[PDB]
Amino acid sequence: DSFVIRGDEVRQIAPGQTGKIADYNYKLPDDFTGCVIAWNSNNLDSKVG
Amino acid sequence: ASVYAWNRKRISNCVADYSVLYNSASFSTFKCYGVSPTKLNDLCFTNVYA
Amino acid sequence: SALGKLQDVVNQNAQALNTLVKQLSSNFGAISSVLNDILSRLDPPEAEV
């Protein structure tokens, strides 16, 4: 599952979290197994304008 | 106030909507310990202090 | 004290029942001894614990 979020919202991609994108964008179950991968993409997914 | 003289305010005799605290994105840290954040609208309290 | 042998059995059984009922008031290290308080205060990841 691939998406782009903010830098402070990477704590919300986790089981048992309270948060905003956890509730209305992307929810993980409490019995989730797997790995969450996050890396900075300011050089690619950002524009000066 | 400063942290050595931290200000304590009593909250009593009011109906409190905590959902405007959860749904606001202005807070960098919103962390509750003895209670779930989403159950705060379902409970009644006294001795509330800020 | 003529009938103490039967009364001893009755008192032991009633005391065992009273102890078993009294043991519900202990939280055993949890935040509360009432299940409804835990289920109304906490999210299921920590209410499970």
B42 is written with which tokens? 């379902």
Amino acid occupying residue C33: S
B47 is written with which tokens? 């001795």
Cβ-count burial B23-33 (b if 16+ within 10 Å, e if not): eeeeeeeeebe
Q: How many residues does chain C have?
A: 49
Q: What is the least distance, in Å, from the CA of A39 to any CA of chain C?
A: 27
Using CA coordinates, name the residue in chain A closest to C42.
Answer: A16
Of B25, B28, B37, the CB nearest to A18: B37
Resolution as reported, in Å: 2.8
In chain C, which residues have their Cβ closer than 8 Å to the Cβ of B42? Answer: 40
B43 is written with which tokens? 């409970």
SS3 category, B49: strand
How would you classify residue B2: left for phi > 0, otherwise alpha for psi between -120 and 50, otherwise beta?
A: beta
CA distances (Å), origin A17, targets B11, C19, C32: 28, 40, 23
CB contact at 8 A, A26 and A13: yes
- SS3 for C1-49 is CCCHHHHHHHHHHHHHHHHHHHHHHCCCCCCCCCHHHHHHHCCHHHHCC
> CB of C45 within 8 Å of any CB in chain A?
yes
- Find chains touching chain A: ≥3 CB pairs under 8 Å: B, C
d(CA A31, CA A28): 8
Continuous segment of H or E residues that includes residue B22:
helix B19-22
d(CA A21, CA A5): 9
User: C45 vs A18: CB contact, 8 Å cut-off?
Assistant: no
Tell which residue, A14, A13, A5, has the closest CA to residue A42. Answer: A5
Amino acid occupying residue C42: L
d(CA A44, CA A21): 22
Sequence-distant (6+) residues with CB within 8 A of A38 are A10, A13
Q: What is the least distance, in Å, from the CA of B13 to any CA of chain C?
A: 21
